[PDB]
Amino acid sequence: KKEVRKVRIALASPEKIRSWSYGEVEKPETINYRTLKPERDGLFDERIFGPIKDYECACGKYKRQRFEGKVCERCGVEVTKSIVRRYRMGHIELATPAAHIWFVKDVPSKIGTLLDLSATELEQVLYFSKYIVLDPKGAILNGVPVEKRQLLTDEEYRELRYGKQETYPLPPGVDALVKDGEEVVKGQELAPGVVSRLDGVALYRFPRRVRVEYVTEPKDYRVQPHMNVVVPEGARVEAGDKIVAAIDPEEEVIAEAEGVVHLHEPASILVVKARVYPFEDDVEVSTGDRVAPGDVLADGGKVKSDVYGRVEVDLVRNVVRVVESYDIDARMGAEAIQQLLKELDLEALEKELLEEMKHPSRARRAKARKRLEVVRAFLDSGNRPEWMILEAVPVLPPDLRPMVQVDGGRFATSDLNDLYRRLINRNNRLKKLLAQGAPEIIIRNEKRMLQEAVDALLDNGRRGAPVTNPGSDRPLRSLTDILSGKQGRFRQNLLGKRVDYSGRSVIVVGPQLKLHQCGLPKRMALELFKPFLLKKMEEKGIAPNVKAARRMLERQRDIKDEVWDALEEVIHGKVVLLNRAPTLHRLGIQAFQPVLVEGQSIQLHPLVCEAFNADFDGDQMAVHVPLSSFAQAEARIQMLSAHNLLSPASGEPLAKPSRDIILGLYYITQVRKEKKGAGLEFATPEEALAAHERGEVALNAPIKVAGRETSVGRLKYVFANPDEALLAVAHGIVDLQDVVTVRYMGKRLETSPGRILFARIVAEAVEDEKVAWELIQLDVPQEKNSLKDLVYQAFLRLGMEKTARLLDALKYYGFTFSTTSGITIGIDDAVIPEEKKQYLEEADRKLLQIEQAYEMGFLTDRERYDQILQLWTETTEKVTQAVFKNFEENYPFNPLYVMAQSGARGNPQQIRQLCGLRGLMQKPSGETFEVPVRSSFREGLTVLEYFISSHGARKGGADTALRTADSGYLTRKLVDVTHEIVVREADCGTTNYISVPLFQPDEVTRSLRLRKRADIEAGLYGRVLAREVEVLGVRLEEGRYLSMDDVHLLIKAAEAGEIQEVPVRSPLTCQTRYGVCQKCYGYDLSMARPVSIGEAVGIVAAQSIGEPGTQLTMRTQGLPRVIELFEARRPKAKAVISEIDGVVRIEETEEKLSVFVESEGFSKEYKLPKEARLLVKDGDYVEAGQPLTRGAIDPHQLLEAKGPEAVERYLVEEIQKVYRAQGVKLHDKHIEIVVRQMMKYVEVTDPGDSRLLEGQVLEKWDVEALNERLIAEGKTPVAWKPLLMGVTKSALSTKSWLSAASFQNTTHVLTEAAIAGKKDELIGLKENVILGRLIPAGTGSDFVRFTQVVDQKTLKAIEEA
């Protein structure tokens, strides 16, 4: 079995379809209503699709195996596996060709481009509204000859094909002013009140009376509608002959004697334009035959035709009349389109467009290029255009459109069966009508309906009203509906599946678990590991065989005790995967060792809750079991929870103490401060001790003795080592928060027993005293940031195992000390400062002043509104400051204050709302109210303030609700556009780099100010130095990975003015195909070491970018700005930039304003709205691409002006601005990868000596390779310009049709791929996932997946051999 490497898609010929089919479906019957067996020649017949039962024909002659390939003579059913019913197709032979709607309705239509017909014309021809001309045969329409590919309405064709034959109903009993059979010119009156309008003869229809002479005298006979006249006009009669033949013997009119005949009072007149020819013998051409000039008609050729027309021999007068018509050949519908398609010669058309490509017109050139694209696709693929017209329609196998009996006995069927039934009914009716010689109106209607049925089968609900089943408004789902959409095959069954060996349950906190363990209920483990448990019980004596084990395990009450021990032995060493939806980053799935617990809840470690973004208010998580050795190895080595301690997005610790742990550590590591002594002066320490003993000074009061600050605690309690200090704490002599002097590590430290205990905890956790002493910060309370830094430093210095041990010890001790700390929340703990009252009264003062200033005309409404807002904002800020100063000075251990300061929970704004006041509120229109909320949540709100705050609450809720969906969509788009980027080699060999700056222009352009430390870290940490750097007597060599310490060293050097920018490698300049290299990427941020070859960095980058957007980013600003930047949309607040260099000269008039940029070569002008704001001043110099107005810059204009690098830097910086505004840490690498994918394409300006066309967009690498080969051969290189397209359009333009088809716009991608005959090489990850293959990443990378392993003994044996 060869391996599958490529997948090709192409158009299918009618021959191919007929070779696929096992037979034609001739009847619309589905199943018999009595026997529930398939009907012969129906949609489920077993002769075509295969038997329902395995190895058993329909009539039962054969019911055993070995008959493979044998077809029963009686029933015609092959004997084989029944599974063939889901593979074998059928087909329907159309009476008339029908057009494939995919190639008709996808704008622009492929048939329209090939046949140079607009969409309206194509729709008119295909759906039987207008004719199209083939072989005009020299016809004349309105004096102009008709030419091929001309569209005629029904009226022009009927005139050309048949002629003009007007009829006038002459009133009964009125004679005509003309006689039958004489040429009548236009305007010659045919009656006293009827006038002709066309040239030609007038013909009598049902003359009301007949005058017959008799040898003379006349006689009159009345001619009634129910009878006809036989004798021709102006023909003599004989005696006994009949004139007015009748049905009734008594009513017959026989001529008495011989006389002439005349016909008067005609009922109607038929005026035609035709020629007349008498004859006296047999004629040659009969009615309905068309003749040409100079053709024999009668009399052996004596009479000859002079014009083209249709001949009809009127026997009544024995005269041949030729009506002027032509033999023009106009056809309708897909048959005509196919006939036009087969006559097309592609080489001549290609030459014609190549000649057209020399036109000075740009629009003509673009249209010709668009036509050439499809023409060349057809020529290269080898597909024939006529294959876009269907002659036989394939029929899907029945098992994919099942008709099944539900458990309740009713029937359930697919809509495809009804669509096929409609198609078959219309096809059969068309065949019957064609076999009957029906008139052309009925046939045209039948063909229109057949075309509409084919369209509904292929794409229902695209043209016109969708087809629905009677009694319902639900449109039927066609094959395309099955293929595409959120519920379609690709997105619902190929990129994601339901799986076995899985479960789900609610999660519960697992504080006693280790970092790598999770609590699994016994029942879940028994159900999940059932086959392993059966095998292990087989090993023991619990069951004789697997079936006995299964029956025993089947009933709950039949399970014993030893089976639980067998299960415990089964799961020994194995891990399971835990997953919480939604999975925003890779950490949403993690591997854990299961510990069997009682109950029904999964127990989760507290330290992974932040990584999972999981809480314990009802959240549920799913459990999966990796089966094979490879899966278990991957889970244990790459997905273990203890092995994933740093964030892949920022490199900062992600599994870290949180919530109660910080609270406990901060409580035990905080030191008391007292005011009883309050800096009193003492001369000798003994006096201080006596004062403390008398009760005059506090134990921890900051006193001064002999000119140096100290406290009574430091002098009274001197401990030799930590054990004595902790023993004294245990006896109640001192508390954990008292400051004493302790001898530790050979030094005398003025510290508290709590800080010593924390140091001992860390040192005993890491099993190293010197390193632990180096890592910790002793002289500060332990809070979130210090603990995170400690975890990061411990990781770097010792490794992930010791970091996990330290984390577990910190968690345990934090919980233990948080339990006994005495943390609680009462109403009196939200202390309201007294200053608040004053702050309010002051405001109430200024308010009055403001009102006065408004009543005397000095202020308008707008100014007063702004002043009120400003005053209340400043009051709110002042109240915040007063609240926190009060908390720090009077109640240093207040629970809310400790929670806010330690970082465990809460932010200053919430504390201010709790204590001081809520503040200003926004109306639903977005503008602030005039009165603020002056009540806090402790005092209790009134109804009105609560109601006004409801506006902001509701707006925030709705904002969240929309933001989550928009962020999910953005994450999906980013993952789809970057999914193919992998680390594929060690070094691409490039010499390009980027220069990361360290100083940014000031907002007033005063000078360059140093960027924030966080931004420099995010832009420099982990990168590879492109060039050597000399800073502070330190030589950073080329190719060095920048660790955090190096980043700090460069920042310090920048603060000393020795350096202004850093040259580094980046993915933006990497040259590896379909990915990046190890050096151009840098660190794997989750391990603080160079990234391994084979890492799927595109998916990681996309997830990393998308994660914060949900919820973290709020909503020109916020998430809309990120969406606009990643799609390269032109901003609606667009600014004006200078395309060229020059000096600025602002010219302002009383009505308009403009800016002229005058360089040394040329002087350009920019007209701008007067309301705009200018960033320039008269007489300054601006570079290309610098802005002249405030607002967002259009990326395409910047690309035109400066080039690719400037746009790269602008996009990266602007995308990072939004994330930095929210406080989110995110490395530049991910955005750089996304931007590199964003700018993947170029446009050809001059093809040179290549086969490419001007304006053809193509991948940059391909054109570079083409240029390289061309210069090697000695030709003219192709000239190209870079392009920039949003993420959606970049993703839809990829080479792989599978990923593009599974992304979006499925019909367009599929039709283009089928026309082009594209081959999918399976380079990216999605195609391999769709095919169920091993992805070319991780263990599936070619760099690592061929490695072998062997011991020394076997290797030596092979060496001897």
Binding site: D415, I441, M449, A465
Partner: protein, 260 residues
């Protein structure tokens, strides 16, 4: 552009109708054309259907794509026949043309009858096309010697064609015409009983009202066999993500445990 019903109606309207004189003329032409066809069949000694096919090909012309060589050969094989016996051929050609005009002019009877048959499982256009099929049959079998108007003979054929099409194409599972009529009788009897008695009737009452040969058991079976399959994509729940067919298990293929 869209709405094919409007296009079809406009095209039908572009053809004028006939008056009594025109109708009798066309019918008489049709009759003499069939008589001439039979006379030519006797004269040449050939099977009538083949000569009919030759005449149809000649009226329709080269435009209508039986092959050109055969029809041309026999066309000239009839031109060999002597005069006096040739008028029949021109009469047959005229009669075939007359059939074309008659059908085009009387197409409106199809729409007029069929517009009151909507809502029986068949769309309007299928009803109309089947009515045109009945109209062709009525035209071919019409005898004008009875002096009856065409509408009288055409309406019966139209109703028969439409009703047969309803019985054959209204249901996914084909049920014979007689059983469909039986179901029709059952439904009308049930609704009449419900209307008179004022509540949903029981099976025994309907069986008693049908007459001899009908019991409650047969009535249950008849209602059972009149059931139509449901769609696998019926939306379940508020959100548009759960379908009925997603809850249907396979009971045919062996399970992994059974295979092991």
């Amino acid at each position: 552009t869209s709405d094919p019903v409007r296009q079809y109606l406009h095209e039908i309207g572009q053809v004028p109708l006939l008056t009594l004189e025109e109708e009798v003329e066309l019918a008489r032409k049709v009759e003499e054309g069939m008589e001439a066809i039979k006379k030519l069949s006797e004269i040449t000694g050939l099977d009538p259907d083949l000569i009919r096919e030759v005449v149809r090909a000649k009226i329709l012309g080269s435009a209508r794509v039986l092959d050109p060589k055969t029809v041309e050969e026999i066309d000239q094989k009839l031109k060999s026949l002597p005069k006096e016996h040739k008028r029949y051929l021109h009469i047959a050609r005229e009669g075939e043309a007359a059939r074309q005009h008659l059908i085009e002019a009387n197409l409106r009877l199809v729409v007029s009858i069929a517009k009151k048959y909507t809502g029986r499982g068949l769309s309007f256009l299928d009803l109309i096309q089947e009515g045109n099929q009945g109209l062709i049959r009525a035209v071919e079998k019409f005898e004008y010697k009875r002096r009856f108007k065409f509408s009288t003979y055409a309406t019966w054929w139209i109703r028969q064609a439409i009703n047969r099409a309803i019985a054959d194409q209204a249901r996914t599972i084909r049920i014979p015409v007689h059983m469909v009529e039986t179901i029709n009788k059952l439904s009308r009897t049930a609704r009449q009983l419900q209307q008179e008695l004022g509540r949903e009737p029981t099976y025994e009452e309907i069986a008693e009202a049908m007459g001899p040969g009908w019991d409650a058991k047969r009535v249950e079976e008849t209602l059972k066999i009149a059931q139509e399959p449901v769609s696998l994509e019926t939306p379940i729940g508020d959100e548009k993500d759960s379908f009925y067919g997603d809850f249907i298990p396979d009971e045919h293929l062996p399970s992994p445990v059974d295979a092991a």
